[PDB]
Amino acid sequence: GSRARVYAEVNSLRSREYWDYEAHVPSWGNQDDYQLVRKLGRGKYSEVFEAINITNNERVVVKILKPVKKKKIKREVKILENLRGGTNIIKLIDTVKDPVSKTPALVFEYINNTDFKQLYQILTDFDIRFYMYELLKALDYCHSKGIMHRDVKPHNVMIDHQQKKLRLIDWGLAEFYHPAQEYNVRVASRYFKGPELLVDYQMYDYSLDMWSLGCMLASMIFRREPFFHGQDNYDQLVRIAKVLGTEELYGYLKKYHIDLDPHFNDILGQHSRKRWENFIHSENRHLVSPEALDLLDKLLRYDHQQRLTAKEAMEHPYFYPVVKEQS
Numbered sequence: 001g002s003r004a005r006v007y008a009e010v011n012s013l014r015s016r017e018y019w020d021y022e023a024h025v026p027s028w029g030n031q032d033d034y035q036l037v038r039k040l041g042r043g044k045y046s047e048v049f050e051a052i053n054i055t056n057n058e059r060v061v062v063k064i065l066k067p068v069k070k071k072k073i074k075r076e077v078k079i080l081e082n083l084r085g086g087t088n089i090i091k092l093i094d095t096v097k098d099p100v101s102k103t104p105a106l107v108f109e110y111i112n113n114t115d116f117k118q119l120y121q122i123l124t125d126f127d128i129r130f131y132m133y134e135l136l137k138a139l140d141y142c143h144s145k146g147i148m149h150r151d152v153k154p155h156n157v158m159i160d161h162q163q164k165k166l167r168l169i170d171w172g173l174a175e176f177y178h179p180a181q182e183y184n185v186r187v188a189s190r191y192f193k194g195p196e197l198l199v200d201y202q203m204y205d206y207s208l209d210m211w212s213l214g215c216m217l218a219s220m221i222f223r224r225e226p227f228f229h230g231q232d233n234y235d236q237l238v239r240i241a242k243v244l245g246t247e248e249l250y251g252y253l254k255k256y257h258i259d260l261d262p263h264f265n266d267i268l269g270q271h272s273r274k275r276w277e278n279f280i281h282s283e284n285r286h287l288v289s290p291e292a293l294d295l296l297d298k299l300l301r302y303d304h305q306q307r308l309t310a311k312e313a314m315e316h317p318y319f320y321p322v323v324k325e326q327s
């Protein structure tokens, strides 16, 4: 068994209504107040548009939900309402429906995002510290609210680099944490999946998000994006093990008595744990410091229990320059 080191019982200590999303009854407003102006993208579950509220000229983002079990809509809506006002969490402005078709949509505050592929190649050392600190605020907040995001990745971290605004978006995979609950491991993008997911360990917690965070930090300070670039879920764990080491993986599996899919036997090979300094070269040296590597080493660990919490990460000396500037 395993449980979170922080906020483990927080949902059990709240009213059932807080976490019992199947019982939640959203108030669905009228989508006709919104004029769609540009398609921003599309996923399995939704289509996203930039829009204008015609009643007050507010620019927003509208996510129109594709056919799904209502349970998942209720989950995302209840999570977003529980996270209301949370630091650097995308603001849900309203839950609306087409008044005729009854197709639901979520209305979010607009962020003028800088494409991450471009942004990440121009970040300074301070920029990385700043944005990572701001992202950690969002994760600490949602964890404190009993919620795992489960899809942390660059595409889900909107950054307006001109106004220095960051928002964690795309809460459709997020769940409530309950001790001892077994969760679906089919969450997160491949490159950001924690080892626990890749070895089919279902008793995971908020610390999954801290692995994904760590992957982002590595990509930023080392300028290798994504940092662990697997070709499929099996290869993803191999890519991790080539850095963190295979004997170290087996120690993790043994501690938690994790059964390893035997297809891994033919592909993991034998790999030493690598020094993080091995990733430094002239193109990234100005982004890497002893403090950055110490932090990264404490995030990208197999053992989910031993990863820093979001709060512990925010307390790390790597962020002292940001704290100073904010004070």
Ligand SMILES: Brc1c(Br)c(Br)c2[nH]nnc2c1Br
Pocket (backbone or CB within 6 Å): 040, 041, 048, 061, 063, 090, 108, 109, 110, 111, 112, 113, 158, 169, 170
């Ligand atoms: Br919510 C949201 C917001 Br806000 C912005 Br901006 C987006 N850009 N692409 N996809 C986006 C989503 Br989903």
